[PDB]
Design an enzyme around this catalytic site. Structure first.
Site, mmCIF file in Angstrom:
data_model
loop_
_atom_site.group_PDB
_atom_site.id
_atom_site.type_symbol
_atom_site.label_atom_id
_atom_site.label_comp_id
_atom_site.label_asym_id
_atom_site.label_seq_id
_atom_site.Cartn_x
_atom_site.Cartn_y
_atom_site.Cartn_z
ATOM 1 N N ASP A 24 -45.333 -114.789 -5.862
ATOM 2 C CA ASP A 24 -45.239 -114.199 -6.823
ATOM 3 C C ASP A 24 -43.899 -114.735 -6.942
ATOM 4 O OD1 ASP A 24 -45.253 -113.859 -9.764
ATOM 5 O OD2 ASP A 24 -44.337 -111.208 -9.116
ATOM 6 N N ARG B 117 -37.190 -114.496 -11.818
ATOM 7 C CA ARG B 117 -36.758 -113.265 -12.060
ATOM 8 C C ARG B 117 -37.282 -112.207 -10.716
ATOM 9 N NH1 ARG B 117 -42.184 -115.247 -14.442
ATOM 10 N NH2 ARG B 117 -44.115 -114.468 -11.922
ATOM 11 N N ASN B 118 -38.065 -112.747 -9.643
ATOM 12 C CA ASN B 118 -37.719 -112.347 -8.538
ATOM 13 C C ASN B 118 -36.947 -113.399 -7.239
ATOM 14 O OD1 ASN B 118 -39.796 -110.714 -8.055
ATOM 15 N ND2 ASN B 118 -41.681 -112.190 -8.569
ATOM 16 N N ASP C 206 -40.200 -108.966 -3.846
ATOM 17 C CA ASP C 206 -41.290 -108.837 -4.242
ATOM 18 C C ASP C 206 -42.191 -109.824 -3.602
ATOM 19 O OD1 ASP C 206 -40.644 -106.411 -6.372
ATOM 20 O OD2 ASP C 206 -40.791 -108.095 -7.349
#
Ligand SMILES: Nc1ncnc2c1ncn2[C@@H]1O[C@H](COP(=O)(O)OP(=O)(O)NP(=O)(O)O)[C@@H](O)[C@H]1O
Ligand SMILES: Nc1ncnc2c1ncn2[C@@H]1O[C@H](COP(=O)(O)OP(=O)(O)NP(=O)(O)O)[C@@H](O)[C@H]1O
Ligand SMILES: O=C1c2ccccc2Nc2ccc(F)cc2N1Cc1ccccc1
Ligand SMILES: O=C1c2ccccc2Nc2ccc(F)cc2N1Cc1ccccc1
Ligand SMILES: [Mg+2]
Ligand SMILES: [Mg+2]
Lengths: 295, 300
Positions: free
Chosen positions: A137, A141-142, A155
Site C-alpha cells: 500500500d 498518502r503513506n 503503513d
C-alpha cells in the site's frame, strides 16, 4: 521482542480524528505514563472492525515484526492495545502525510525537496526489501512528513493482515501477486503524485477499468515539471514484466545523482526562489522535532 | 548555524510555567512561516541585566549557550531580541527534577537517584571542559527529559545578568568567587535535594546566617536513605578548601560505581520494584520523546 509495547487502555486517550483509510481510523492521542502527570502526543490507529482474540494473536505476531524496523526513513510501530477493537500507537507526525503536504505547498516546492523525497522513499523501501517486507500500500498518502526535510514510509504490512487499484502493479490486480517489484510499481505512482503536486492518478477513469488500460499499454502522463530522464524512471517502474522494473537500490542512486543537479532534471517556475533549508533551520527543526540520526 | 534568530510572528507564548531570579518561562508554540503546524516550545523572557548589554553582546553570549553538545546539557535553540530578550529551548513536559522528586516522594528507586547523580556530574564535567561556570546549579535547574534522562539547564544566566545562598559555596557568599569548584558545592546541595526527595535546604534558617553556620562547621544533615558512603560525597563537596572538593570527573566515577550495586548505597523501602524501566518501556519512551538515545544508565 521488547520493541513493541503492550499498553493498557487506561494510559492513552483520543483527542482528535486525523483521518480514516481502508483499514481503520487514525487519531491524535495523548499518552499518560502511569504514575505521571504528563500528556505525550501520539498517533493512534483504531482498526476498521473488532477482532476476536484468536485473530488478535495474528495481529500481535505481525505487530512485533512491524515494531522491529530500524531505519531513518521507515516508521516503527511502537505499541498496541488489544481491546475488542485493536488500537495501535506510533509517533505523531504533526506535518501529516506527504500527499497533503505537496498539495498544500503546490508550486511552492523546489526541485531540491522533490528529488530528496524520492531518494528518502527509495531508501525506506530498499530497507523494507532487505527485511523481506512487502508494503502492498505504498502511496504518497503513506509517506509521512516528520520535517519538510525528512520523510518516512508508514503503513507497510497492514494490507496483508486485514484495494488501491490505481497504485497496484498489473499482476497484483489480476492475480493478487504482491512482491517487492510490485512495490516498485507503487513507488513509481508515488513519485508521479509528488511531481504533479498531488494529482489523482488516472483521474476520471473507474478503478474497475484500470487493468484493461494497463494491458493496452496506457500509463500515467508525463508531469509538466519532469524532464525525460525523470519520467523514464517512472515509466520503467511500470513495465509489465516485473523483473524489468528497477531495483530500489538503483532508484536511490538515480535520484541521488539527480538531486545533485536538481534544476537539470525538474523544470519548475520560480525554482530560483525556493530553497533547501539553511543549516540554521536544519538544526532548529532537528532539536525541536527530529533528534534521530540520518544522512 | 546553532542559534536560530526568530521573528516575533513565528512564535507565541501560551502559559506561564514559572519564574526565577532571571526571567519568566512560558509554554509556547513555534509556527514555521508558510506551515500550518504548531510546535510546543519553552520560551524564557529575561528580565533586565544589572549591567548594560548591547544586542550584539547578548547575541554573542547566547551563541555560546547554543554551542554546547552533550546529552546531559540543555542547548539554547533560538533567540528573539526585538521586544525583550526571549530565548527558545526544547519544552520539557516533565518539568524540573526538583518538582519530579517531590512529586514521586518515597516512590523513587536507588537506580534512578544514583543514575541522576551520574548524569548531572556528566553534564557538569562537560560544562567544565567548555570552561562554563554554572553559578546556579540546583535541583530546579536539572530538567527531566524522561525519568531516565536528565539534563542541566540555565547555565551562564547568572553571569549574563544579575540569591541562591543555600546552594552557593562559602567563597561565593563571602567574596563572589565563582569557579567550577564552587559549582561542585552546589552539586553537593543538589544531590542532597534528590536524596531528601526535594526538601528545602536549611529550612527556616535565614540566608544571612548560612555563612556563619558553615564557618562553624555545620552542614546539611545526612538524608535517611543515604548510607554514609553517599553522605561522605556530599560532605566532601562542602569543604571550605575549594581545591579539596572532588572533581566532577571523580563524581562520575564514584556514583557510577555505586549505581552498579544501588541497594548497597541507598536504603529505600520497597526499592526492589523501583528498578529502571524494562527494555520494552525504555524503547517506548525513547521513540516517543527521546530519540537522543544516550540515557547513560549504569545498571546493577
Ligand atoms: N503517525 C501519524 N501521524 C500523523 N498523521 C498520521 C499518522 N498516521 C496516519 N496519519 C494520517 O491520518 C489519516 C489516516 O490515515 P490512514 O488511516 O492510513 O488512511 P490512508 O493512509 O489515507 N489510506 P490507506 O493507508 O491506504 O488505507 C491520514 O490523513 C494520514 O495522513
Ligand atoms: N525547557 C523547559 N521546559 C519545561 N519547563 C521548564 C523549562 N525551563 C524551565 N522550566 C520551568 O519553568 C519554571 C521557571 O524556571 P526558572 O525561570 O529557571 O526558575 P528556577 O529555575 O526555578 N529558579 P532559577 O533558575 O535559579 O532563577 C520552573 O518551574 C522550571 O521548572
Ligand atoms: O496500522 C498500522 C499497522 C498495524 C499492524 C501491522 C502493520 C501496520 N503498519 C505500520 C507500520 C509502521 C508504523 F509506524 C505504523 C503502522 N500502522 C499505522 C499506525 C499505527 C499506529 C498509529 C497510527 C498509525
Ligand atoms: O535562559 C536561558 C539562558 C539565556 C542566556 C544565556 C544562558 C542561558 N542559559 C541556558 C542554557 C541552556 C539552555 F538550554 C537554556 C538556557 N536558558 C533557559 C531557557 C531558554 C529558553 C527557554 C526556557 C529556558
Ligand atoms: Mg495510511
Ligand atoms: Mg531555572
Amino acid at each position: 521482542q521488547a520493541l513493541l509495547r503492550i499498553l493498557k487502555e487506561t494510559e492513552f486517550k483520543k483527542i482528535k480524528v486525523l483521518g480514516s483509510g481502508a483499514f481503520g481510523t487514525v487519531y491524535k492521542g495523548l499518552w499518560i505514563p502511569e504514575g505521571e502527570k504528563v500528556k505525550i502526543p501520539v498517533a493512534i490507529k483504531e482498526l476498521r472492525e473488532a477482532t476476536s482474540p484468536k485473530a488478535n494473536k495474528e495481529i500481535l505476531d505481525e505487530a512485533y515484526v512491524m515494531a522491529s524496523v530500524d531505519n531513518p526513513h521507515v516508521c516503527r510501530l511502537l505499541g498496541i492495545c488489544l481491546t475488542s477493537t485493536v488500537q495501535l500507537i506510533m509517533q505523531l507526525m504533526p506535518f501529516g502525510c506527504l500527499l497533503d503536504y505537496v498539495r498544500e505547498h503546490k508550486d511552492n516546492i523546489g526541485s531540491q525537496y522533490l528529488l530528496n523525497w524520492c531518494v528518502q522513499i527509495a531508501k525506506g523501501m530498499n530497507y523494507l526489501e532487505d527485511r523481506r517486507l512487502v508494503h502492498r500500500d505504498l502511496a504518497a498518502r503513506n509517506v509521512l512528513v516528520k520535517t519538510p526535510q525528512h520523510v518516512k514510509i508508514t503503513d507497510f504490512g497492514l494490507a496483508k493482515l486485514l484495494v488501491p487499484i490505481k497504485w497496484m502493479a498489473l499482476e497484483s490486480i489480476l492475480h493478487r501477486i504482491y512482491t517487492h517489484q510490485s512495490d516498485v510499481w507503487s513507488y513509481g505512482v508515488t513519485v508521479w503524485e509528488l511531481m504533479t503536486f498531488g494529482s489523482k492518478p488516472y483521474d476520471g477513469i473507474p478503478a474497475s477499468e484500470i487493468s484493461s488500460i494497463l494491458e493496452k499499454g496506457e500509463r500515467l502522463p508525463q508531469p509538466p515539471i519532469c524532464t525525460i530522464d525523470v519520467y523514464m524512471i517512472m515509466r520503467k517502474c511500470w513495465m509489465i514484466d516485473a523483473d524489468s522494473r528497477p531495483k530500489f537500490r538503483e532508484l536511490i542512486i538515480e535520484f541521488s545523482k539527480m538531486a545533485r543537479d536538481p534544476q537539470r532534471y525538474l523544470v519548475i517556475q520560480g525554482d530560483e526562489r525556493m530553497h533547501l533549508p539553511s543549516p540554521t533551520d536544519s538544526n532548529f527543526y532537528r532539536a525541536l522535532m527530529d533528534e534521530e540520526d540520518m544522512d
